[PDB]
Amino acid sequence: MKRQKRDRLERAQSQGYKAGLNGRSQEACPYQQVDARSYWLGGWRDARDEKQSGLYKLEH
Template sequence: MRRLKRDPMERAFQRGYQHGVQGKSRDTCPFTAASIRQEWLNGWREGRADHWDGFTGISGVHRLNEMHAVG
């Protein structure tokens, strides 16, 4: 069975979140398209906030799943 491709905006958000929660710089954003870059930065900001709040490792992954289940 073939898997459907995930939404590129959702993937950008998740990748940005992962970079943010790991404490990486926002300058590491790999995207140049404005809308996708903005979504990556939104994820990065959420990840940084969770990093500062102590949501690292597995708890950060669970937090990411919770955010997308609600939204």
């Protein structure tokens, strides 16, 4: 174990996505802070807004 910079974020990338559907909030981001923002929170926002775009009821 040496290249563990990417490791916890590589999986945070997937975890964040799931956290969008299952985790509800960003409160459940138990990996890195800043680097997890760009990884974990990236998938988090994506997952939500993807299922969010499906609810195109209003134009607003």
